[PDB]
């Protein structure tokens, strides 16, 4: 009778506490099972007082490169567009085939980037092309992380074939000035190796050919390199969980539930005693 | 004397004991609200074989579209600009009535676009606009996520009324070629649905209108339309804080709190033991 | 013989379980030192019903203003360009020293931006100067977020001179329309103030200059800084180790640990029952 009830009733709540655990682990798993198929982002600036030279892959085509200058102050000085002028940078000329055509051949103009952000340090470049019949003149380029790198590494045409998927391309039109601001982001991956990409942001200028003001009628291109700011931008994901932390929370949770269900035991004998004073 | 001095400075650290109890348990009421309010968000690049069309949506107004093609090509091949060319994409006609203007109706030139990236597909259109008296001469577009969803949609004034709104729209000037390089970002948020936005860098390439050299004098909009890559960014938001883990952490603390309790009277013990040897 | 084996077997599982308790506190220390390196970022959006007046220091040179006009359309009128128009905004001209020349005083005209952004309210400004031989013709603008502010605060030149540093300063070209859309970040760090960065999305539309069609041949500048949305993106990390939740957890598992021990002495007084049956 009482003494049945009072007796299947603790059974059941000892039952409760383990289905309390049942159901702690089964939300333990499916969190577990979340967290590790959403990893949370970090990003975190590192500031670089110098660049490593990155290196520019051009791809002029029949654009003939006027000059190529570096410049430490904010602005380029004056120059006398048209003409070829003197060329102060480092260049290397590589002809590779790009494995997404794998049958066409590309030349590539690779020239070495600027250095030192801190000094506004950019690398101005004019290219010249003959009349031509394509209505829109472009000058693809390719940034990657380092040009001494491709200068001390073996079959070089691996090396472009690398960048022509790790990185990407962009394009820079004649009659503008396209000053292009590039920075770094190194993306961490679980699997070892940390992946290097150019952000950039492209700000176009008109050119005045005025001062022509005759028959040339020639496409220029004119291109400003600088870095953006001295921060590299390091994001890397986390897996927020762990088996390790998980097993410490769950083993604490049933140690809790084993107190409890001591202390139920406890209560049992309160209740005993106080029926014994009556 | 010391028997008393004893027993009150162990009853003060049964209550600092509790005192440290409740301090944890203030810290983790701050701390579970803290994360409430700050989630933290996780992004993750799901790669895609080929994207659903897309649907562009055009404001001409007054332009005259003289051409759209679907080029495989990495590049679109020579052009005749200036007349009428062969069409050869799917354009849907539509007059809606913006809900910010609701006096104001728009047409709109809903065109589909691209679907294999990895075929590096592009949709290139071709707009001509007589003399006008405007000295900036722009068309919006407004791109959504499927055109077939346009296209099996009733109220297609509905669907379009609400892509002025979940969609931001841009502008493609007279005289480039902006190239729209396109990637999807979905958002999931708490309350189910997903929403999908449509990420765009656009790089504009002077349209040389040596051929004309007439007096043609008419304005002429060049725009392709591309994936940028076969990545689409999932971003979600993570709640950090979940009140099964708290309350089996705070569980874990009060238990091992207990046994410390425990450990002090057995260390009475001990110490009673000591002065009884004595 | 076998009771020895026994007794080194239980004592080698309770240094098991030290040597568990070990590896478990050392891994908390990794992670912890892990957790610290790497904070996690949290972006909010926060919905604003209209901006505070932003400053948008402009520095034409010998570029002249020919006019300013706050437009809540969400388009500018047509114009009469090249000729001064009427000037509708409150504009603030400062000549202060650049701290990275030191030496050169540059002078800015200091414009209040849109703040209705819900109205669609956009700042439009068109500049003209004259005769030049810089082949390459452009206005630095740099935006800071409220004018308000720069108005009264005392040596504006110190306030400027923060600009010039913790904003970025970009360009707009002459013979476009330089639309500007503009957006707020608030990064909020570990050390107090939160910091307001200004990022901007611009779009080039040609000018059309067929309307002189004289011998004017002076660059035109047109510009418009309106906001890209009610949208301010709240950037923050997240600590997320904290030293309460790690002492919990490894209160826990030593808990959890210690009952295990007590546990395999239940098991070595079972064992001894069982061979007293025997
Ligand atoms: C093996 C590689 C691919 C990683 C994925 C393995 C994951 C899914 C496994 C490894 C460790 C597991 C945890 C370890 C053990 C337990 C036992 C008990 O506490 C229930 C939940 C819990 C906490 C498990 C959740 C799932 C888990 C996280
Ligand atoms: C109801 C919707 C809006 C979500 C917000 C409810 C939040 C604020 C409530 C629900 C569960 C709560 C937790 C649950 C119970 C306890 C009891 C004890 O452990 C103190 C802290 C702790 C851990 C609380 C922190 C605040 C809490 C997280
Ligand atoms: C002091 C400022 C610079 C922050 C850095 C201090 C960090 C490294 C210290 C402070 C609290 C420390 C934790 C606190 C105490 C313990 C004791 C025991 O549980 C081992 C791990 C654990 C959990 C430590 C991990 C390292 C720790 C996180």
Known sequence: CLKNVFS??????????????????????????????????????????????????????????????????????????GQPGDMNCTTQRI????????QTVKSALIV????????????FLQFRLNKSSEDFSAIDYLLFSSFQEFLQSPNRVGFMQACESAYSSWKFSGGFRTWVKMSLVKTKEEDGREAVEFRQETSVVNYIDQRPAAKKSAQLFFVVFEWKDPFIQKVQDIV?????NTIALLCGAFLALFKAAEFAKLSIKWMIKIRKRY
Chains 1, 2, 3 share one sequence.
């Open 8 to 81: 299947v009733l603790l059974i059941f709540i000892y039952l409760l506490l383990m289905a309390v655990a049942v159901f702690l682990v089964y939300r333990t798993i499916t969190d577990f099972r979340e967290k590790l198929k959403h990893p949370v982002m970090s990003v975190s600036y590192k500031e670089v007082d110098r660049y490593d030279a990155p290196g520019i892959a051009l791809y002029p085509g029949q654009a003939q490169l006027l000059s190529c200058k570096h410049h430490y102050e904010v602005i380029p000085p004056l120059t006398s567009p």
């Open 95 to 102: 002809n590779y085939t790009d494995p997404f055509s794998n």
């Open 240 to 244: 927020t969980a762990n088996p390790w």
């Open 112 to 123: 070495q980037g600027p250095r030192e952000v801190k000094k506004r340090e950019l690398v």
